Amino acid sequence: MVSPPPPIADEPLTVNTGIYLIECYSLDDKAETFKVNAFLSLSWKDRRLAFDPVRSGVRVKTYEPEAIWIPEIRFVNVENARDADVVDISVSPDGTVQYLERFSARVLSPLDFRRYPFDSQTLHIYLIVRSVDTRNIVLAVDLEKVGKNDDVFLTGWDIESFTAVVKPANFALEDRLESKLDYQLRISRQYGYFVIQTYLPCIMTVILSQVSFWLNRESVPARTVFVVTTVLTMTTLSISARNSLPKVAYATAMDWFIAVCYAFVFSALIEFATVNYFTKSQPARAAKIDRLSRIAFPLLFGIFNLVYWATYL
Amino acid sequence: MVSPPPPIADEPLTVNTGIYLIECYSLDDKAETFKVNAFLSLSWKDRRLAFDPVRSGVRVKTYEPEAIWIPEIRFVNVENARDADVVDISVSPDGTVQYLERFSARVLSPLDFRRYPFDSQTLHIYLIVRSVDTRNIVLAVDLEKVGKNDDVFLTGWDIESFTAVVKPANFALEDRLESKLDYQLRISRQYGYFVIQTYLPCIMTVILSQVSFWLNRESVPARTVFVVTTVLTMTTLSISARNSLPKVAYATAMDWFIAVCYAFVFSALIEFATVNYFTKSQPARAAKIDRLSRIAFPLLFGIFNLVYWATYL
Amino acid sequence: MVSPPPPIADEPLTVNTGIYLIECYSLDDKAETFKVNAFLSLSWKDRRLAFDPVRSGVRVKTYEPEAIWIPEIRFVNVENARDADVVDISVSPDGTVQYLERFSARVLSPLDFRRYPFDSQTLHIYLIVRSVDTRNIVLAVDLEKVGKNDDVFLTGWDIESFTAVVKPANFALEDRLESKLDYQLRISRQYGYFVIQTYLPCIMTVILSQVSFWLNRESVPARTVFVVTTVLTMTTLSISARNSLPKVAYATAMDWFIAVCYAFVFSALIEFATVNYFTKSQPARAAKIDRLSRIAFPLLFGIFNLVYWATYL
Amino acid sequence: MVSPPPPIADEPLTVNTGIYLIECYSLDDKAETFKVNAFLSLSWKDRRLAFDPVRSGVRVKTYEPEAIWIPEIRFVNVENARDADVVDISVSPDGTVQYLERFSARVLSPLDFRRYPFDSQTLHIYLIVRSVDTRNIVLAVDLEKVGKNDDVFLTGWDIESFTAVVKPANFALEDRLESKLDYQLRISRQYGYFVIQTYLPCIMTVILSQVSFWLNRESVPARTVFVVTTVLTMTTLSISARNSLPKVAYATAMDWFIAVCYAFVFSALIEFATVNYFTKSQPARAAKIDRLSRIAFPLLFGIFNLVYWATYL
Amino acid sequence: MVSPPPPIADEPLTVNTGIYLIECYSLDDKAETFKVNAFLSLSWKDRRLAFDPVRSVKTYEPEAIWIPEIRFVNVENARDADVVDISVSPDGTVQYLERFSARVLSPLDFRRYPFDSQTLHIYLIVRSVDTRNIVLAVDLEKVGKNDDVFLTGWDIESFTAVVKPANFALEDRLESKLDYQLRISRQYGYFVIQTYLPCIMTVILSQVSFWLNRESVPARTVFVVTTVLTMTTLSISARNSLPKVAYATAMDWFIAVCYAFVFSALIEFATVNYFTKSQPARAAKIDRLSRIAFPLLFGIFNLVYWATYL
Ligand SMILES: C[C@]12CC[C@@H](O)C[C@@H]1CC[C@@H]1[C@@H]2CC[C@]2(C)[C@@H](C(=O)CO)CC[C@@H]12
Numbered sequence A, B, C, D: 001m002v003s004p005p006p007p008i009a010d011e012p013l014t015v016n017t018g019i020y021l022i023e024c025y026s027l028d029d030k031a032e033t034f035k036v037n038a039f040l041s042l043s044w045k046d047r048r049l050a051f052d053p054v055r056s057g058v059r060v061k062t063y064e065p066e067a068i069w070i071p072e073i074r075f076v077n078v079e080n081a082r083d084a085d086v087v088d089i090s091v092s093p094d095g096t097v098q099y100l101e102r103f104s105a106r107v108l109s110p111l112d113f114r115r116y117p118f119d120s121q122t123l124h125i126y127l128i129v130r131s132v133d134t135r136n137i138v139l140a141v142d143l144e145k146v147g148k149n150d151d152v153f154l155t156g157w158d159i160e161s162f163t164a165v166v167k168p169a170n171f172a173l174e175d176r177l178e179s180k181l182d183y184q185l186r187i188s189r190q191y192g193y194f195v196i197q198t199y200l201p202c203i204m205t206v207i208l209s210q211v212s213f214w215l216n217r218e219s220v221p222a223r224t225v226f227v228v229t230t231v232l233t234m235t236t237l238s239i240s241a242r243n244s245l246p247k248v249a250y251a252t253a254m255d256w257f258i259a260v261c262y263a264f265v266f267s268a269l270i271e272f273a274t275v276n277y278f279t280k281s282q283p284a285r286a287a288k289i290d291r292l293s294r295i296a297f298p299l300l301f302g303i304f305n306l307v308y309w310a311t312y313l
Numbered sequence E: 001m002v003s004p005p006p007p008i009a010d011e012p013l014t015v016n017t018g019i020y021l022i023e024c025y026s027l028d029d030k031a032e033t034f035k036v037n038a039f040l041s042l043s044w045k046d047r048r049l050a051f052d053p054v055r056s057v058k059t060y061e062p063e064a065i066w067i068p069e070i071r072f073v074n075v076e077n078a079r080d081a082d083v084v085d086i087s088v089s090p091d092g093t094v095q096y097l098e099r100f101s102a103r104v105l106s107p108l109d110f111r112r113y114p115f116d117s118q119t120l121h122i123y124l125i126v127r128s129v130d131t132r133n134i135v136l137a138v139d140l141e142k143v144g145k146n147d148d149v150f151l152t153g154w155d156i157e158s159f160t161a162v163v164k165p166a167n168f169a170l171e172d173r174l175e176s177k178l179d180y181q182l183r184i185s186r187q188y189g190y191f192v193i194q195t196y197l198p199c200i201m202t203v204i205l206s207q208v209s210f211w212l213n214r215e216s217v218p219a220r221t222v223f224v225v226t227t228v229l230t231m232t233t234l235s236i237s238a239r240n241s242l243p244k245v246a247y248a249t250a251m252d253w254f255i256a257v258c259y260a261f262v263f264s265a266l267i268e269f270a271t272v273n274y275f276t277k278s279q280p281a282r283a284a285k286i287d288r289l290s291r292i293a294f295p296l297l298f299g300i301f302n303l304v305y306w307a308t309y310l
């Protein structure tokens, strides 16, 4: 068929859109993609399909997508074109078409890891339509048709809300009008897992590094093993932790925690080296160094943990 | 075509459903997905298709799916629309259509890892049908048509039973009635593998850490090597083990075992540090500490193992 | 079309089947799947297609799959429906259809790792056909049409034989007769690779563990490094080795070898701890322990290797 | 249909091409591939489609691709044939066809890692068309139709520009003329990530290796632990780092940095061995060695870092 | 349609074949597969399609005329092909041209690895129909490869075809098989700096132990033990890149000899330590000789090895 001609001769055709999330899975932090399976509902007026509700003994009548003109609606931030199965098409006596499909798609949406792993994100799904030569087409949001099933889960996340920005973005693209809607899924990460995946190994490794201050200054190899193995452990945990993320330029909150832990551990190494350096000559100085490290380190570390967990919680 | 109109003018069309599991594979603990290949059987009454068994020399007659109306049956908790090959369609003289297809699909079903690796799960397969404007459609379960092939296996699991909840869940979705059935595959994990993957390295690492109490207190480096390497081994086993699971918020039984082992090992480190701290001044105290530790540690560890394996077995 | 009517009115239609392996690749131990690319040949009698060999000056005549009835043959133990390209269809004057297609498929067949890596397996490919309402259909095996190309290889394996069980399994399924053939690919693993992947690191790690008995008893740290590092090496090799297999409940022969090596190494640890425990008081006892160990350990290990390699070779 | 015949009887048909990047993702350094989703716009003259703008009350008129001849345009440096959805086809009264599709494709384009990770690249997308026997076909670039969406991101790169080389490469291939255009996406890597992934572990490992010069020369085991563990750490970081790249023949800037760090650390090992060799006889020599090393090493390292970061920044 | 009937009534129809490599990527050493994207060109004589050039090239759609079913043997799935052109000649000569991509499965010989050369094979095959026997041939004009073809780890020597095909019987029909051969040689330098250097340096490090004071037993223990475990790790790591081949590669030999030298250094340290109190002259002599023999035997070994495999 052809696009619905304008009654006002100069009126844009608006398509009322709605998405209802059925399934949400495969949120890939490294790929910054996730997979979604949902209903897409579109609704518009085409009087050419109108009919008398009394002369015609049918109350609605239903068409197949090949029978009538349907607007070409595309997703923007997606990897391939979605896979969709048309579910239903119902026309009204006045000519109002209500189209309903179920689709799955891999959406590509960038994440802000600065606050990670205490981060919240807004996943975006951009709808777009390109105007034809006969008529301009404009997108709109039917709030009645937006929502998500209750059994929608992201195993690592809390799902806050799924909403749409009602006013669309209309703009020129290659000499035609495009209309783009922004659906927004707000989510916040469940950080507890990482607490026992990285934060505990780091804190315990720092404590282990601090145990060296209580060993006899003359047993140099023991303290060497402690300091060195704790340093290498810190480095390994750092690299391991950053291996979960994409190659982002900035630093995450976990990056800061790990870097400060590395500071404390390397400071323990420098302390061990200084004390050993002063052990023969000036044993009073070395002894005082151990005494102060033994008080300062766990105190500064406790204060640091307090400021950090107070801040990011 | 269109849906069969009701004879009672107000009667819902019920679709008799059945699933027969043929193949079950690719149970991914991290993705909380598994792949299934089975028969789907549907059966309903469409009088329009009735025929004279005598005038028509056929006792059944068979149609192609394009020939007759077939209800749109969808899976809910699936990643993509299933891949199906229609196997057979048999109409009865009275108009009873019996439809049979074979499908494969990737089902997405969440797992409860709290008791892991001693966990049981119910994998769900939700069938759903959406009512059309001419008639409401309702799902039901033909028990004769439910089951699973004997050579169905989950390499890591024992399969208990495959049953269906007979009463469906009917609800409103985007202004239409939907009918949902819940097929339930009950399975229980075979934990033995993990016993030799994680639990043994942990137990042996604890014993190794305890060996340090029997080394001469003056040979500080040896005990340092024991304690430190055992601590780092415990940390490595913990991280490694938790790397097999999805980012669940809670803690598994394995988490508890590993955490208690880590408690014992780090406690052995603190013991070595205390003994070394009291070795020059008050050697009687240090000696008494080792004397008691050699009895307490393996005893508390044996008791703990008793409570744990007694509980989770 | 429709299925060939029976001449005996009560005679089952047999389909003569054959598979000719062209390519065999991607044997996945963890997934218990492999990919196969082969010929499938079917042969049956449809009198409707018969013709006079003299009146018709053609010796065979060939049809397209859409032209004639073709039996719906399905694989059982497969992940998706196969991908098939029809190669040829030739009818005989008497009505004998010979159909030939080339297909690729991902077959799922469980492996028995108990004897691994000295294991042999039977990979299964189950063919099946479902009876229609007009006639019962039964599978059979045409040995002339079974075989494999000589350049068929599964890297890391010896291919013994590819045969078929001639008598099929006929059984009732959802009120219809099904006919199932069992094609069997017998293979045996090439263990030599693992000899240099796991067995040598273990044997050398045991020898290294035994070196500790010859170091001076007063150099406690050296022996500590030996015993501890060798123990951790054993643990690492065990975990690494079991990482190649699926989560099987049982233990493989490699598992037994590694476990016995761990027994010897941990026993060397206990020996080092005992000798160190008796080094100050009763130096004769410790000396005797080292003296005996230096003979017993490598002897018991040699005998063990003798029994093991004698058994599994 | 067939291609538009030439008016000059000898004139080549040019197709005006444009690509508008919508989505850019999955830049795989190891595979040297990336995935792209964009608009492809083609424009050519087919006087067979001309029409009177007055007799025909329409100003453009739009066709389906099956209705009219469309040039076979292929990508060269792609893995599979692209996936395209035709978006619009608009003819002008003069016969000017404007075709617009949206496609996704996996482009294969080699990278120059010599300056990695301080590298810039030009990703190429080569368009090509093969001439038919009725007419030669030539490609051209419509600058109005080239560009990229503002929300185009490579989660690790700065995108400089997306341009086209206007003069195409025309050449003979298998006895027909081929016409090839070169679209060029210029990008430059964000190296900061690697600074904290590899460069910091290396620098800290070097400093740690230098700490050994300040330990008492008599505590030989401590210095041994330092030097040896730092050497193995350097080796591990080197291998790990090169594990991110494809098997390129040449050496990267990171390769040079790591190799120089390895030089400094192994030189620290040789220094420790020499000092230990001269510790009993000629302690003055050993002392002089440590005294000089403590000044030389960190100076040569500082200067080295200055030249390196000055050069590659 | 049906296959072209023979003019001699008993003559086989030959199909002139050619492959032109456009794209070559994803050579997987572990899977022994590679991916190829190329032109396939076929040429044969069908007089039924001949025509008077004066009364009337002319081009058909593949559905319009009979086209021979040509299959690849050593492939995982059937290729994906887009027909590019079909041109008939006045005499009936059909020239068909398609562009295809396929994942070819071809075994590699790792014995000389990583100094190995390989011949990747692409086997074409055609099955004879009941009306006529079909035989394959090679149109040299139609064989080649684009210049910008690269294997990101290999030097490409040549791409040629064996002109004489292999004809044989398969399930009661004649099959005709062509062997296209892509000769390549591996660029070993990467492995030179991935494994061989860590091995050589690990051996040197193991040798440093002979110069430490014999009384400092723990230091030498650290050297020997860590160097041994490093050797083991490098061996396992290296063999993790290859399929589970039965035989041994040249890298296997280099790593095995390095392991021999390192474990020999461990045995030397243990012997010296065993004789340090009683017979210190013997231990001293052992170190004296070792310090000369080890680096000499190792240098000579490297000379023979790199001389041989280059
Ligand atoms: C920072 C630097 C010099 C600059 C690089 O070579 C790195 C070393 C690391 C070890 C440091 C050394 C400076 C002197 C220190 C602090 C010694 C002292 O207490 C001096 O009395 C003990 C450890 C030594």
Ligand SMILES: C[C@]12CC[C@@H](O)C[C@@H]1CC[C@@H]1[C@@H]2CC[C@]2(C)[C@@H](C(=O)CO)CC[C@@H]12
Residues within 6 Å of the ligand: A207, A210, A211, A214, A294, A297, A298, B270, B273, B274, B277
């Ligand atoms: C907990 C803390 C201080 C707070 C952090 O720096 C961590 C260390 C770890 C080592 C501990 C130390 C406190 C004092 C201990 C218990 C010593 C004593 O028995 C003193 O009698 C031996 C080991 C020492």
Ligand SMILES: C[C@]12CC[C@@H](O)C[C@@H]1CC[C@@H]1[C@@H]2CC[C@]2(C)[C@@H](C(=O)CO)CC[C@@H]12
Residues within 6 Å of the ligand: B207, B210, B211, B212, B214, B294, B297, B298, C270, C273, C274, C275, C277
């Ligand atoms: C097995 C056990 C007890 C049970 C767990 O606590 C683990 C320890 C590990 C260290 C063992 C100890 C038993 C006594 C041993 C063998 C000592 C003796 O030869 C006594 O002469 C040296 C090392 C000691």
Ligand SMILES: C[C@]12CC[C@@H](O)C[C@@H]1CC[C@@H]1[C@@H]2CC[C@]2(C)[C@@H](C(=O)CO)CC[C@@H]12
Residues within 6 Å of the ligand: D270, D273, D274, D275, D277, E204, E207, E208, E211, E291, E294, E295
């Ligand atoms: C390079 C070489 C010989 C050649 C291989 O066996 C490797 C060793 C490594 C240890 C080196 C040795 C040469 C002599 C050195 C430099 C000793 C000296 O200062 C000599 O005064 C200390 C460490 C020794």
Ligand SMILES: C[C@]12CC[C@@H](O)C[C@@H]1CC[C@@H]1[C@@H]2CC[C@]2(C)[C@@H](C(=O)CO)CC[C@@H]12
Residues within 6 Å of the ligand: C207, C210, C211, C214, C294, C297, C298, E267, E270, E271, E272, E274
């Ligand atoms: C090969 C064997 C015995 C057989 C297995 O238990 C493995 C050990 C490994 C350590 C070897 C030992 C034999 C005796 C050696 C060579 C000692 C001597 O110099 C003998 O004087 C030092 C290291 C010892």
Ligand SMILES: [Cl-]
Residues within 6 Å of the ligand: B073, B074, B075, B076, B078, B080, B081, B082
């Ligand atoms: Cl579905």
Ligand SMILES: [Cl-]
Residues within 6 Å of the ligand: D073, D074, D075, D078, D080, D081, D082
């Ligand atoms: Cl393309």
